[PDB]
Amino acid sequence: TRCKLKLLRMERIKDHLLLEEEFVSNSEILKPFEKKQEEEKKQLEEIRGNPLSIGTLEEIIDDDHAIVTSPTMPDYYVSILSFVDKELLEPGCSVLLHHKTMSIVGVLQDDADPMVSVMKMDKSPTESYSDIGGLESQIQEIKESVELPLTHPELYEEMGIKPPKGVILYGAPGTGKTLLAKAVANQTSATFLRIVGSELIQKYLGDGPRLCRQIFKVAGENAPSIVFIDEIDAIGTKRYDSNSGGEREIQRTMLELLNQLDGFDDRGDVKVIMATNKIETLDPALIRPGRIDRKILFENPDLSTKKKILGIHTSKMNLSEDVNLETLVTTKDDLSGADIQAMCTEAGLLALRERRMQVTAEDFKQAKERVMKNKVEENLEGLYL
Amino acid sequence: TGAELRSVCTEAGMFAIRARRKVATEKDFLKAVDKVISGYKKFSSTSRYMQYN
Amino acid sequence: AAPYAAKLKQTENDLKDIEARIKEKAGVKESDTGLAPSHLWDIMGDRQRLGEEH
Amino acid sequence: MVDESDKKQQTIDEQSQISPEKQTPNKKDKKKEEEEQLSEEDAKLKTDLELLVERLKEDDSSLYEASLNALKESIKNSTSSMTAVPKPLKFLRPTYPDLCSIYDKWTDPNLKSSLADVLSILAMTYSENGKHDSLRYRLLSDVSDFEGWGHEYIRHLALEIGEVYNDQVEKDAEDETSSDGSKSDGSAATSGFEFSKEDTLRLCLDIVPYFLKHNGEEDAVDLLLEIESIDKLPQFVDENTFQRVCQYMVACVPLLPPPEDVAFLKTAYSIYLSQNELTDAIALAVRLGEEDMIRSVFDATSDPVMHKQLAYILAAQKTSFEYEGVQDIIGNGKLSEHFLYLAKELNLTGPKVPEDIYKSHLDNSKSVFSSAGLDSAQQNLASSFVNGFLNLGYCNDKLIVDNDNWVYKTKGDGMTSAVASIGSIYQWNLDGLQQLDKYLYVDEPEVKAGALLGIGISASGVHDGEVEPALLLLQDYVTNPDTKISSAAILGLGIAFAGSKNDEVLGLLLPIAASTDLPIETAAMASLALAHVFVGTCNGDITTSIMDNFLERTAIELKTDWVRFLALALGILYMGQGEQVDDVLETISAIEHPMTSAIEVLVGSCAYTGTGDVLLIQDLLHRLTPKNVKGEEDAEIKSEEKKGKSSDKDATTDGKNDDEEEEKEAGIVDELAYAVLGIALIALGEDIGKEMSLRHFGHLMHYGNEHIRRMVPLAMGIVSVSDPQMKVFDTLTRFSHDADLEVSMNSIFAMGLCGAGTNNARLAQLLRQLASYYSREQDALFITRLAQGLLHLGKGTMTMDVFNDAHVLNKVTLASILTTAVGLVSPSFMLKHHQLFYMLNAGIRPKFILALNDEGEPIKVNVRVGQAVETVGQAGRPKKITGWITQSTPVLLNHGERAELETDEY
Amino acid sequence: GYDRALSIFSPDGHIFQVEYALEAVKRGTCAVGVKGKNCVVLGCERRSTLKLQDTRITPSKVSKIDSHVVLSFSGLNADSRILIEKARVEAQSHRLTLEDPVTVEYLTRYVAGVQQRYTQSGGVRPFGVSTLIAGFDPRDDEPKLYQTEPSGIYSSWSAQTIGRNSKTVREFLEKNYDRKEPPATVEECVKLTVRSLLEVVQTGAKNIEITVVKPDSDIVALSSEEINQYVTQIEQEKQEQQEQDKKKKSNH
Amino acid sequence: RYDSRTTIFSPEGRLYQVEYALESISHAGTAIGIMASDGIVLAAERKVTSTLLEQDTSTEKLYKLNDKIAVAVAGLTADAEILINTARIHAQNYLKTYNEDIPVEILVRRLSDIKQGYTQHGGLRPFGVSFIYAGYDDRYGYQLYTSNPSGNYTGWKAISVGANTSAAQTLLQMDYKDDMKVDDAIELALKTLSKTTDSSALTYDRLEFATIRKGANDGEVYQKIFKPQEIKDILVKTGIT
Amino acid sequence: HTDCKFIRVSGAELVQKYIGEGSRMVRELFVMAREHAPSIIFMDEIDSIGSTRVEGSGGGDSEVQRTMLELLNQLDGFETSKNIKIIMATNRLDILDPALL
Ligand SMILES: Nc1ncnc2c1ncn2[C@@H]1O[C@H](COP(=O)(O)OP(=O)(O)OP(=O)(O)O)[C@@H](O)[C@H]1O
Numbered sequence A: 001t002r003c004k005l006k007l008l009r010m011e012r013i014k015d016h017l018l019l020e021e022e023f024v025s026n027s028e029i030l031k032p033f034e035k036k037q038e039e040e041k042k043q044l045e046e047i048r049g050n051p052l053s054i055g056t057l058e059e060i061i062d063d064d065h066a067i068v069t070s071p072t073m074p075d076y077y078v079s080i081l082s083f084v085d086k087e088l089l090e091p092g093c094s095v096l097l098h099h100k101t102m103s104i105v106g107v108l109q110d111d112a113d114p115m116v117s118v119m120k121m122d123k124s125p126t127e128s129y130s131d132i133g134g135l136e137s138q139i140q141e142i143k144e145s146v147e148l149p150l151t152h153p154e155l156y157e158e159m160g161i162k163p164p165k166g167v168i169l170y171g172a173p174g175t176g177k178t179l180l181a182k183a184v185a186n187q188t189s190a191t192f193l194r195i196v197g198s199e200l201i202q203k204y205l206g207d208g209p210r211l212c213r214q215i216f217k218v219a220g221e222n223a224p225s226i227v228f229i230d231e232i233d234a235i236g237t238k239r240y241d242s243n244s245g246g247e248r249e250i251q252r253t254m255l256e257l258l259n260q261l262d263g264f265d266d267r268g269d270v271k272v273i274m275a276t277n278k279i280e281t282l283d284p285a286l287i288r289p290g291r292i293d294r295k296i297l298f299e300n301p302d303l304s305t306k307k308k309i310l311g312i313h314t315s316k317m318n319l320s321e322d323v324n325l326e327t328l329v330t331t332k333d334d335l336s337g338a339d340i341q342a343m344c345t346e347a348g349l350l351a352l353r354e355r356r357m358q359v360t361a362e363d364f365k366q367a368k369e370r371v372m373k374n375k376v377e378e379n380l381e382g383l384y385l
Numbered sequence B: 001t002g003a004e005l006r007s008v009c010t011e012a013g014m015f016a017i018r019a020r021r022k023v024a025t026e027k028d029f030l031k032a033v034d035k036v037i038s039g040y041k042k043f044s045s046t047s048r049y050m051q052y053n
Numbered sequence C: 001a002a003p004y005a006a007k008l009k010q011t012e013n014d015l016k017d018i019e020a021r022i023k024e025k026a027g028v029k030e031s032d033t034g035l036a037p038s039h040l041w042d043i044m045g046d047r048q049r050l051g052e053e054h
Numbered sequence D: 001m002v003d004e005s006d007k008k009q010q011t012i013d014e015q016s017q018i019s020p021e022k023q024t025p026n027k028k029d030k031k032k033e034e035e036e037q038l039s040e041e042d043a044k045l046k047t048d049l050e051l052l053v054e055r056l057k058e059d060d061s062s063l064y065e066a067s068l069n070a071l072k073e074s075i076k077n078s079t080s081s082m083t084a085v086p087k088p089l090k091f092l093r094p095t096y097p098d099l100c101s102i103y104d105k106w107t108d109p110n111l112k113s114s115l116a117d118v119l120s121i122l123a124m125t126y127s128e129n130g131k132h133d134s135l136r137y138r139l140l141s142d143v144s145d146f147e148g149w150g151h152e153y154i155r156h157l158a159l160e161i162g163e164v165y166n167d168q169v170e171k172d173a174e175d176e177t178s179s180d181g182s183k184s185d186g187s188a189a190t191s192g193f194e195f196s197k198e199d200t201l202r203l204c205l206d207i208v209p210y211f212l213k214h215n216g217e218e219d220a221v222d223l224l225l226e227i228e229s230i231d232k233l234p235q236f237v238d239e240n241t242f243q244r245v246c247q248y249m250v251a252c253v254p255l256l257p258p259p260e261d262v263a264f265l266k267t268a269y270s271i272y273l274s275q276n277e278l279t280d281a282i283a284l285a286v287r288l289g290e291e292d293m294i295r296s297v298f299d300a301t302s303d304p305v306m307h308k309q310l311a312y313i314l315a316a317q318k319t320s321f322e323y324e325g326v327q328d329i330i331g332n333g334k335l336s337e338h339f340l341y342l343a344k345e346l347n348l349t350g351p352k353v354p355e356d357i358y359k360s361h362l363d364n365s366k367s368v369f370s371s372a373g374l375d376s377a378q379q380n381l382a383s384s385f386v387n388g389f390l391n392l393g394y395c396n397d398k399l400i401v402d403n404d405n406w407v408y409k410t411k412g413d414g415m416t417s418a419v420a421s422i423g424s425i426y427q428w429n430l431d432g433l434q435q436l437d438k439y440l441y442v443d444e445p446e447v448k449a450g451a452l453l454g455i456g457i458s459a460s461g462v463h464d465g466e467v468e469p470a471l472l473l474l475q476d477y478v479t480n481p482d483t484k485i486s487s488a489a490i491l492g493l494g495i496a497f498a499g500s501k502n503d504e505v506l507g508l509l510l511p512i513a514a515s516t517d518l519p520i521e522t523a524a525m526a527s528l529a530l531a532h533v534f535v536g537t538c539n540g541d542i543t544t545s546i547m548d549n550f551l552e553r554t555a556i557e558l559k560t561d562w563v564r565f566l567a568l569a570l571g572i573l574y575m576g577q578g579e580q581v582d583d584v585l586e587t588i589s590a591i592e593h594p595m596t597s598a599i600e601v602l603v604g605s606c607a608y609t610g611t612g613d614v615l616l617i618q619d620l621l622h623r624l625t626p627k628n629v630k631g632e633e634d635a636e637i638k639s640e641e642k643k644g645k646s647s648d649k650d651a652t653t654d655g656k657n658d659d660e661e662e663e664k665e666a667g668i669v670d671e672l673a674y675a676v677l678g679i680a681l682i683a684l685g686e687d688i689g690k691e692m693s694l695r696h697f698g699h700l701m702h703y704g705n706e707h708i709r710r711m712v713p714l715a716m717g718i719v720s721v722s723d724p725q726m727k728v729f730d731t732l733t734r735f736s737h738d739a740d741l742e743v744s745m746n747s748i749f750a751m752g753l754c755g756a757g758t759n760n761a762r763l764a765q766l767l768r769q770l771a772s773y774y775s776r777e778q779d780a781l782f783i784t785r786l787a788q789g790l791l792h793l794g795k796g797t798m799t800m801d802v803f804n805d806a807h808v809l810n811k812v813t814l815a816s817i818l819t820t821a822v823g824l825v826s827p828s829f830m831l832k833h834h835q836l837f838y839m840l841n842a843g844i845r846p847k848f849i850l851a852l853n854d855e856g857e858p859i860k861v862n863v864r865v866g867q868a869v870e871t872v873g874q875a876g877r878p879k880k881i882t883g884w885i886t887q888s889t890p891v892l893l894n895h896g897e898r899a900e901l902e903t904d905e906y
Numbered sequence E: 001g002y003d004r005a006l007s008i009f010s011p012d013g014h015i016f017q018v019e020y021a022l023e024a025v026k027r028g029t030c031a032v033g034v035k036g037k038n039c040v041v042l043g044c045e046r047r048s049t050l051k052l053q054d055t056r057i058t059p060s061k062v063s064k065i066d067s068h069v070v071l072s073f074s075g076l077n078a079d080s081r082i083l084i085e086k087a088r089v090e091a092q093s094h095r096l097t098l099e100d101p102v103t104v105e106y107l108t109r110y111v112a113g114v115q116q117r118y119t120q121s122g123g124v125r126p127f128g129v130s131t132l133i134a135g136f137d138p139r140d141d142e143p144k145l146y147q148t149e150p151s152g153i154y155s156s157w158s159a160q161t162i163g164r165n166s167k168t169v170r171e172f173l174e175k176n177y178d179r180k181e182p183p184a185t186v187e188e189c190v191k192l193t194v195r196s197l198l199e200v201v202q203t204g205a206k207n208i209e210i211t212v213v214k215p216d217s218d219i220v221a222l223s224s225e226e227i228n229q230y231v232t233q234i235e236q237e238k239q240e241q242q243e244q245d246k247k248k249k250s251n252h
Numbered sequence F: 001r002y003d004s005r006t007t008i009f010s011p012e013g014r015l016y017q018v019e020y021a022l023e024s025i026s027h028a029g030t031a032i033g034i035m036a037s038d039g040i041v042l043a044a045e046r047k048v049t050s051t052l053l054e055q056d057t058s059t060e061k062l063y064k065l066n067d068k069i070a071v072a073v074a075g076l077t078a079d080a081e082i083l084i085n086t087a088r089i090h091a092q093n094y095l096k097t098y099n100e101d102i103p104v105e106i107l108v109r110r111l112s113d114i115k116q117g118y119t120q121h122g123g124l125r126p127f128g129v130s131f132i133y134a135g136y137d138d139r140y141g142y143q144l145y146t147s148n149p150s151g152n153y154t155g156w157k158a159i160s161v162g163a164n165t166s167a168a169q170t171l172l173q174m175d176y177k178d179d180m181k182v183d184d185a186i187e188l189a190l191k192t193l194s195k196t197t198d199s200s201a202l203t204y205d206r207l208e209f210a211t212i213r214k215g216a217n218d219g220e221v222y223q224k225i226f227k228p229q230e231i232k233d234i235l236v237k238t239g240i241t
Numbered sequence G: 001h002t003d004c005k006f007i008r009v010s011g012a013e014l015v016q017k018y019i020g021e022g023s024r025m026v027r028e029l030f031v032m033a034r035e036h037a038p039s040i041i042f043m044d045e046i047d048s049i050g051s052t053r054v055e056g057s058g059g060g061d062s063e064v065q066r067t068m069l070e071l072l073n074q075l076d077g078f079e080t081s082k083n084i085k086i087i088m089a090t091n092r093l094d095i096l097d098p099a100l101l
């Protein structure tokens, strides 16, 4: 009660305070100027006419004119006018056009697309270790590759070797490789994109590889960044049969993805996290290295690991009075972390049902048998015995 | 792969980095090959007979 | 869960107060693109723009 | 659920879920008829108690409401609670839940209100019996599981809280208020609270702090001491007891005014003193800042034990840790009195041993130079200061300095500062004096002055145990009547001794700081040193400084520079205190002039600190007012005005920084956002105001200890490149310095772009260059922090010169000051009796997880790293000790404190 | 490619059938060998299914190849039967010809030869079985323990672990055991084997089987009573151990 | 995959052929041996039926190998035919050579070896037969084994092979006891069979039975395949009919 | 009985080709659900047919797998949820779509 109150006091007062000052000051910005900053506003509003169309700047033409491509089929011949100079514009940049007579207003789109909003995350994960149950060595490796060069370059200076350009996570299903990536994303204080790897794949000629290219384009500008692309067995080399639309698509996306990642001078400071679940469909030109510079195997928990996952989860569940943790982990063999996460939620559930306001021993043991049914192989003592 | 040959020197360097040592021994390059090769074997051809021999 | 549940309820109230800043912040802005010395060129541009050869 | 009569005991419970027969009808009739049934009723109480216990498990609102409906009526209608006296009183056990069933299980707005009041009265009456305590206990530790009690039990406790809080808000108090109807004190409810506290401390956490802060007395806190000190190890480990105590104190920080807040933490220290760990003790004694408390923890280990033992070594270590050195002076000489060994002890308390350890670190960290090559004109001056800014702390770069070619090309004020930068190569070092001596005995008076400053810097790390004190060298210079010489002398003495207010240091500085009738600019340094000397420990708010500030104002107003510096020295002087500072605001204000009004807003920040949220709203009304008055109408003055405006802005920032640190760590985020809305409001409104607020901002961050360091300095920098006063960049870089090479990778590129790109005045270029070099120490040599380090709530002393200099438009004179930048952090190492210079292993974790502490004690899981590594800055601060597996035990708990680790091996 | 027969060599220069045989070893039961200086102890994990399986009429994992040579095994239970039979007929053929007790060294080479034979030809797979063969030499008291692998390479090892989760036993064994000073007394030797199997069995001393082979053609298989007696002493000292770290840490 | 020969192994050290050959035995009818310390009863369920199938004059999954050991059959009948004939010859070969009948443990071992050989050597199928062995020999008394098609054997006090293996085994061990009785054992096979089978009639025409006892006479050992009209008679007594 | 918004969604999702085929519009489902919260989702992938189908990693299995996979990523999410619950109905779990469970 006292610990919560202490945090709650500081964060409510200041944030509520920052809110109230913004209200008062916002009015107060305006009064100083009225003809000293006002003038630029009046001239833009008149030239723009308010309605405006986009154009893409095709090229410049020497005499303060330019030629633009509209989103409609005809191109048009524009003149370069207004405040925005032609050293602030180059070909390959988006421009705004005036309604009545198409004219270079200036740029303000800055090559926006609705896919940038999707790349861009705003949601923040939990997530740090001490919510990651064991795998000490695995925690360490991803921290040295992805967290560390950014925070401390000092070690990288002293030795004088380039920093890891990526890491690839692979292993058994449901191992919770996803926590570790999330944990990296929270702690860094870096621009975190992603995306799912199933989002670059479409069916429309040439749109797919350009969406691949776009991720890097946004990262390289707002570098250092980290890019997490999930599920690379949705963008492998695999068969595609015949009489399919998607047979070209899968080929092209992957190709563009490959060049950008290697660079030709590279981004040089954007690290990547790839995660995947089938390594028998992965292409061979993406796990050879300069791309990725560790490769790490995840495996299902063992006794020490299980006790840690378990250990964190039970402390967030009330009254484990007659509950011994050790006796459960001993009997359990060959399970995922997913299965232990599940057993805590199930065991609490049985405690509710018992008409009991607390968990027991017997609530836990019943739940444990249930989840062993789900993940089972027996051909070890079937073959042997 | 010649690329993975480049990755040896980087990885060897990683071992010197966490050890806080200001140089890279002969020993830690031994580890650096061992990690890359042993990982790669996971995908293609496993095992040796020099695990007891 | 009363001793600490009370403080939780106050935390949701805080979330809405931070949201109200996002709205507020947008309410007054000041922007400008181009550079200030190109003001004379705007003057020219109205004479060409108005005109028809483009 | 359905009635099923008396066939068996199972169906008897079922029978009474709809309608009791052993609690309703029978009992009611008996009580309302015969009074020999008073006897039957007494035996039947037990039976009735049991039937509740069985149906507790049932939760449905309807089958508790209605069942016990008529019993609720009976309190006043039929029994009238005094038909047989004693007998309803002891028969209130079961009738008390009946009332609670209408408060809480069923919600009828009209009754839920009314019956709160009833419940309070009867809680009191029945707690004389001390059986109201037992009623509470059977729901607190539980017998049965249902949702219902998890909400209900809070109400019973809430009755007590209700009344006790209100006695602070309304003066009439007691049961005169009909809001509770229950007496605030008396020997009837007081015994109830103590007993309630016991049961709730064991199982829960909720109400134990509420009771203290509502009584408001240091007395509540001293009862807590007794009970908890029993619990210290057999009920649960040391560790757990500690985390509660400080959770109580740190959480309620904002709502404790000055006298109340010192008075509470006294008791937390003492709790710590009683318990096994004296390590927890020393840390609180420091918080308070009182001399009195430092001495008891140091004494407790030194005086009993006749032998050297562990006991002497431990005392020294503990005082050694504050590099304010306020503890250093006090503890010294006890060591002399006892006389086992003078030689080891005296050196170890002293910051003399901290130099030696630095050499071990330096050895990993090596030397990489990156200094400017630029020579001729103002660029010569720029480069020669830059050399010192890169080789801050103990460094050896002797040879470069000995090349007197570049040294001599400095000119003017550049000559003094050039010698002063040299002193910072040998910052925190015995050796280096030599370099300074050559110049001091030759050429113009200028080089002589600059030598004294550097002495000041070198002496920072050797000034105790009567081993070359700065006092010794610099006294001779004070006597010499030339002003430059004498001014320089007292600036360095003040820096070196820092917080140390030793008799010789203090008393040299006491007649003086009292001539301002003669008009001399550089005599800012007269008061400026003494203010610095004063911080780190409780203040007298010395009568020397207060008299002289007033005198100067009488005499002159011409030198605007002189009087702006003076105003600040007063505010920095009062740092280390807040209770006594409420007085001096008035004293200063007695004499009223618009020029005096500038002094006041500054001082307001130090008096209100540590409860300030009134202070905040005030420093914002000020801001608005120039503009506002003008606003109404629309629908000699020069000096006074300017002081007026400028003061306010400094004051707003100082206020914030100090509050956020001590208060909720959450609140640190919010205060930065408020600042940005203050600056935005100023950029439009006043042209002149904008200049001051830029510079202030960098030190806003460095003081406040912002969590974020990546985004905000960089972003802000860009706007302010266009904006005049390149001194902005220096104030940002002191925050950004961080764990060198994390934040600061981004920083060198960002600060460097504007400098290198733009050159349109060499004046402008000079500020930019210096800022850049400051930021980085090669391969993480050291970190600077405003904070102590030993507390993270803590505030430094040595870093107060940095904090002073961001109040004025840039000056070449100011450059000379700027060389001084002191505020080192030691790298921890595991010590041994032969003084091992190596750490075994440590855990580091960017972010703590524990939410019991807002500070967050280290997790025990962490990420593992090697020997002899700097104690990391942000995103690495939580530090746990790994050594336990090699069968080694810390003696000195370290959580990421400045302090050096120390170990005992089995 | 290249694992589809034993007769492809592959460009990585492995005969896959041998490499894959090693992974089959894992399926069987832990087996541990430790030599002393007057004994060899040869112990193995005994799998327990249910109470409806016996342990009377049901085969142990330790098998006598003679009266002075013993064998424990890991691998397919089916495979191991013929491996053992053929080895045994050789052990007798040796006295038929020479009239000598079999040499320990001669025997191990014969069993590695049989696996090697199978491995060389492509008409068969090899026995997917690694064994440890313990014994004492015809008249010397010098203790001998040898290991075979499916490949038909034999080595001498002072102590070796094979079967299910062999590696985790190997590291503990490596630490505690010395070739500077092996156990002088059979009793500590037996308990070291018990300590190794403690880890991998978890609960039970009815999942640990001990047999000892000593010089002068003595082979004895030890009783459930004696094994339960060894495991309880380990269990008591281990309980005590935990307490001592807890004291020692407080003490410093 | 690594189906394609039987003399290969797989990346995991399984062999698909050994697994596939094993699943063959859960395609053919339930077979149950329950050992009791007063006899062993063998009981088996048929896997074929129809009003014009003759099954009321015949056994086809109870074979006496020799005169003191017999087997119940589960698996393919073709696979079964050859190995039953080989097994009977070796059991009886011992008879000739040593002039005393073969022990239980040796004969199961022999036949397991033959099984194993088809996997180990050549380009042949493994044999998909699981035989429940019930014998008596005076070394260990009553002995129950079953042999896997992998070709190894483990002793048992009750076992069930053939269809619905998992279900049967659970059923047997709920109601079994170590003291037991031979008469309680018969009733137990009949108990288990009702549940396990997918025919709800479960009449004589579906049922085989033989009990091997040394309590039958004294000093003598009697293997008795019951005849069809006894199998009917005992179904009334356990009440299934 | 729940009285929440369902987002049945029948036996395939390749039944919509008005904006083209769902290859990356599968993810659009979660957005539309989150707004109208609670998000109780029901899905049929009965999967009684094809005893072999789990070893695949795939030909044009790949299209429908890319649809199946993107569901899982979105579900587990990153990491905010609005009590999203997926009821599945299926014939077997032995005869199942690879990596659905
Ligand atoms: N070490 C752990 N600590 C805590 N929770 C765990 C741990 N391991 C597993 N879990 C829980 O189980 C879930 C299983 O992981 P999840 O299903 O996200 O798969 P993954 O293998 O990481 O997936 P993909 O290949 O799709 O990226 C985790 O997200 C978490 O909820």
Ligand SMILES: [Mg+2]
Residues within 6 Å of the ligand: A176, A177, A178, A275
């Ligand atoms: Mg994942």
